[PDB]
Design a protein around this ligand. Structure first.
Ligand SMILES: O=C(O)c1ccc(-c2oc3c(Br)cc(Br)cc3c(=O)c2O)cc1
Length: 333
């Protein structure tokens, strides 16, 4: 048997046509700075891979953000650093300003730009229909760039999207799981938050591409327009696929399995059963109908697909009628 191979429909060989230095990050040499150039003000958040502090650049008295990294392989550190430097300057990509090492503890610390972030737990209450469309378009601009730069984020989630609603600014952060795309490469399925794990990550299909990020975005869009965060709320990875199967149906799931000859785990076939593909009207009620339109539902359906190749690309998504009002307003400046 063996699973059927896969290639990205867009930006397939962009990395092949680049210098080895670009994607071969194990050979990247980091230029460190002194963390005594920064004074920490307060902890902004914790996490599995880092603890994030607000800090001050004492050489110019300007607010920055210090991400003190948790002990991971040196390889993964170089990967995140190289990717950040490669994507630096891109649309709504977080800006890496410095890379310092504490003189005492000798720990790697990435220094980022400061953005007045309002948390989505309080932000998703003041968002209008236009606000959702607008910010979705902003994430797409960041995703289309990094995809065109041969990089998939592999960890798209609300926690990783900083938003300055007062200044309409958006930034895509945390690229510690991001990876360079190479046609034919089998990647680790152990990426992204459980609720945003694509079906390929759950059925153990390792040859995925940029389309993984498009799934996660779909989970964000579903959460926003239906006011259910998170939309696919599973208790583990096995149940996660079941929660997905209860919406998109088991019909397309087993066709997905059959097409790519994916050997399915002997546990799934006992908890999946059979389900019909529910219409998106079944998730529309009085409290969220002001966010749901035929344009909204059409755009969503074209993101949440088992077959990663049938999902929209970032650019294809940016040309959807769902963003027609946003595009016209951005052209008038
Ligand atoms: O690469 C990362 O993992 C990564 C994490 C956090 C920030 C990051 O977090 C903020 C938080 Br949390 C709260 C507030 Br207020 C501001 C920020 C901010 O400006 C900022 O860059 C940037 C990048």
């Amino acid at each position: 048997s063996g699973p059927v191979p896969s290639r990205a429909r867009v930006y397939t060989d962009v990395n092949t046509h680049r210098p080895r230095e670009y994607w071969d990050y194990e050979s990247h040499v980091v230029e460190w700075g002194n963390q005594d150039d920064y004074q920490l003000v307060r902890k902004l958040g914790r996490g599995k891979y880092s603890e994030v502090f607000e800090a001050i650049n004492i050489t110019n008295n300007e607010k920055v953000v210090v991400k003190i990294l948790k002990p991971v392989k040196k390889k993964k550190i170089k990967r995140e650093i190289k990717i950040l430097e490669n994507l630096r300057g891109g649309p709504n990509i977080i800006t890496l300003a410095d890379i310092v090492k504490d003189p005492v503890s000798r720990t790697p610390a990435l220094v980022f730009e400061h953005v007045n972030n309002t948390d989505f737990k309080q932000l998703y209450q003041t968002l209008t229909d236009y606000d959702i469309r607008f910010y979705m378009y902003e994430i797409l601009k960041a995703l289309d760039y990094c995809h065109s730069m041969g990089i998939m984020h592999r960890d798209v989630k609300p926690h990783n999207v900083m938003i300055d609603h007062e200044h309409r600014k958006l930034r895509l952060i945390d690229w510690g799981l991001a990876e360079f795309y190479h046609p034919g490469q089998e990647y680790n399925v152990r990426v992204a938050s459980r609720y945003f794990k694509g079906p390929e990550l759950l059925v153990d299909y390792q040859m995925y591409d940029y389309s993984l990020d498009m799934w996660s975005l779909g989970c964000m869009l579903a959460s926003m327009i239906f006011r259910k965060e998170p939309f696919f709320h599973g208790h583990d990875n096995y149940d996660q696929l079941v929660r997905i199967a209860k919406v998109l149906g088991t019909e397309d799931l087993y066709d997905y399995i059959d097409k790519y000859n994916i050997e399915l785990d002997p546990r799934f076939n006992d908890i999946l059963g059979r389900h019909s593909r529910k219409r998106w009207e079944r998730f529309v009620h009085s409290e969220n109908q002001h966010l749901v339109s035929p344009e909204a539902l059409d755009f969503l359906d074209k993101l949440l697909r088992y077959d990663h190749q049938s999902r929209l690309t970032a650019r294809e998504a940016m040309e959807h009628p769902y963003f027609y009002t946003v595009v016209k307003d951005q052209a008038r400046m």
